[PDB]
Paper text:
The SARS-CoV-2 main protease (Mpro) is a cysteine protease that induces scission at 11 sites within polyproteins ppla and pplab, and its inhibition blocks the liberation and maturation of proteins required for viral propagation. The active site of Mpro contains four subsites (S1’, S1, S2, S3) that accommodate the amino acids of the peptide substrate (P1’, P1, P2, and P3). The Mpro enzyme has a stringent requirement for glutamine in the P1 position, which occupies the S1 subsite. An affinity selection of a 4-billion-membered DNA-encoded chemical library (DECL) using Mpro as bait produces novel non-covalent and non-peptide-based small molecule inhibitors of Mpro with low nanomolar Ki values.
We also determined structures of Mpro in complex with CDD-1819 and CDD-1845. Of note, the unchanged benzimidazole ring is in the identical position in the S1 subsite for all three compounds. Both CDD-1819 and CDD-1845 contain a truncation of the n-propyl chain to a methyl group that resides in the S1’ pocket. The most significant change is the replacement of the tri-fluorophenyl with naphthalene in both CDD-1819 and CDD-1845. The naphthalene group more fully occupies the S2 subsite, where increased hydrophobicity is consistent with the increased potency of these compounds compared to CDD-1733. The addition of low micromolar concentrations of CDD-1845 (IC50 = 2.39 μM) and CDD-1819 (IC50 = 2.88 μM) was found effective in restoring the normalized cell index, indicating that cell proliferation was unaffected and virus replication was completely prevented. In line with in vitro results above, CDD-1935 showed little inhibitory activity at the concentrations tested in contrast to CDD-1733, CDD-1819, and CDD-1845 which all showed potent activity in a cellular context with IC50 values of 648, 34, and 98 nM respectively.
Author numbering:
A (entry chain A), B (entry chain A): 1 to 302
Write the structure that this text describes.
């Protein structure tokens, strides 16, 4: 029993992290086969970021302008290209530790593990969620650019995030592994800011199911709500609308606990309208929204 | 910026996890050099656990009674011995992925990363703390016995915990890697239970320093307290006594933020006496006590 913020084992990703140096700036890169992936703003000076034309800036660079270091051995760059906002450095050596992997662009509300890295060396691992406003509330300092987020399914590492920048509110913005930013953010020094955020409703419900699985029932009630009447309350408390697909996704958890999905919704409605009254759920005094239904199944069932 | 429950990268430990099978029971083992470490109750039937004499039970076993499987390859047991409550199976092959490692017995209040494992395959990683009552609030299901806890310093893996059992309250008890249980617990089916627990005061203070480092100051005040007057309040709220050594340990964090340790104590005193009044600290509505001063330095400074 028990319930924790569980990250995936990071070993398969640790063997892929390298250090990329262009000029006076150094960040992290992802080494898969004979290609190293890193944010394209590694080629930019501080003055370049005011209004960068990356096509113009990259054509002035050559292969020897990039130093790739994997642990102790230096990797030679034999080719470079630009795909959206990620730079791809072809190297003469294929990574022998390359795992089975995919590149996946995730939806808001989905979770992933983050391997925080500095100078190509892994520093720590933690679980994150893609917020509805397409930021992540990570833990990143200077030099963490190029750290990646990922999920693991059986044997395959699904990379879904690469860290690019920190917004003024202290939250973080990045791209998928093919260089497309999540949200409206761009790799340029401008006045962009994180938009208003909402609570991931389907995740709160899954986490309430996790509490029931672990033997906590104090928040349940005898009531049921309609999907429409629940979403009227969700809108009032800045919660994401609950769809029929979300209800269908919560099916297995509802079947294991014997609590209908719309019954759990009436419980969440009561929790939003009255608060938690000094009690806690799974050790938290707040409704937690960074566990997907799949996260709960993975941990409460192994 | 940001602050998360950060576990250590688990790659060095993943390469050491194996599966140990004795009879009809299977659990996890730790493979370092030519020795596999696992809980000694792997040799026990359910009826053996009522009043086991492990010396008597192990002398009836032979090397071929143990099946050790590292991924796909089966490892041959060439010797077995018992050290306190851990069984040591000598194998004919030394683990090529053996990292630099120590065995360390930690103090209550210290934190470590847990690599939850099932059938020798890593399932997830999360951060834990040794509670003052010598239990851990982990996330473990059936088959997780043999999973280990660890810290990493530079290149060395300091193993400090091996999972043995789950107590009736759903918390977990285990040993160091030399077989000595934390707390008064024993590997026998008896009516043992977790004792009353307390809050790790020095950790709450470090976590308040982390909040200041990340730009939050709403809980600070102009007041100071004496160490004796603070401990009078700590005792009232089931907090661990704060020692001069704890004050000295919080030195670097106090120097970086410019907030004296006893000044932070007056802030914590006010927080305990009035609550948090609907506000949050680092995204939590409760005072968090599973970050050591070293944990905060590691994450807020990289
Ligand atoms: C809005 N700025 C940004 O978030 C900048 C500062 C960021 N940084 C980080 C970094 C990553 N997580 C969190 C951070 C917190 C504090 C300081 C730095 C970081 N680790 C880095 C490693 C190497 C270089 C940079 C850097 O500074 N690069 C320069 C060329 C730069 C300048 C302005 C930029 C504006 C927008 C996007 C990218 C921009 C990029 C790095 C990119
Ligand atoms: C108080 N019981 C226990 O916590 C028992 C049940 C535990 N278990 C776990 C396990 C580990 N985390 C959490 C669990 C939650 C639910 C069920 C099992 C676990 N994964 C296991 C993998 C293999 C075997 C066992 C097991 O069941 N072994 C048998 C011989 C046993 C029986 C009674 C015991 C009493 C005390 C100590 C050890 C005892 C051990 C395993 C050891």
């Amino acid at each position: 029993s028990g319930f924790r913020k569980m990250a995936f084992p990071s070993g398969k990703v640790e063997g892929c992290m390298v250090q990329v140096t262009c000029g006076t700036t150094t960040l992290n890169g992802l080494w898969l086969d004979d290609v190293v992936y890193c944010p394209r703003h590694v080629i930019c000076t501080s003055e370049d970021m005011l209004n960068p034309n990356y096509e113009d800036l990259l054509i002035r660079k050559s292969n020897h302008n990039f130093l790739v270091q994997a642990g102790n051995v230096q990797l030679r760059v034999i080719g470079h290209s630009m795909q959206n906002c990620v730079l791809k450095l072809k190297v003469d050596t294929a990574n022998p530790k390359t795992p089975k992997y995919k590149f996946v662009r995730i939806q808001p509300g989905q979770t992933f593990s983050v391997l925080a890295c500095y100078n190509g060396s892994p520093s720590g691992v933690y679980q994150c969620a893609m917020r509805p406003n397409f930021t992540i509330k990570g833990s990143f300092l200077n030099g963490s650019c190029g750290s990646v987020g990922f999920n693991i399914d059986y044997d395959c590492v699904s990379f879904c995030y690469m860290h690019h920048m920190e917004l003024p509110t202290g939250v973080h913005a990045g791209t998928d592994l093919e260089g497309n930013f999540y949200g409206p953010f761009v790799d340029r020094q401008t006045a962009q800011a994180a938009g208003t955020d909402t609570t991931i409703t389907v995740n709160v419900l899954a986490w309430l199911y996790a509490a029931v699985i672990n033997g906590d029932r104090w928040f349940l009630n005898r009531f049921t709500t309609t999907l429409n009447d629940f979403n009227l309350v969700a809108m009032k408390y800045n919660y994401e609308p609950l769809t029929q697909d979300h209800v269908d996704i919560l099916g297995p958890l509802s079947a294991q606990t014997g609590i209908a999905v719309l019954d759990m919704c009436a419980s969440l409605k009561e929790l939003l309208q009255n608060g938690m009254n000094g009690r806690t759920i799974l050790g938290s005094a707040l409704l937690e929204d960074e566990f997907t239904p799949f996260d709960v199944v993975r941990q409460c069932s192994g």
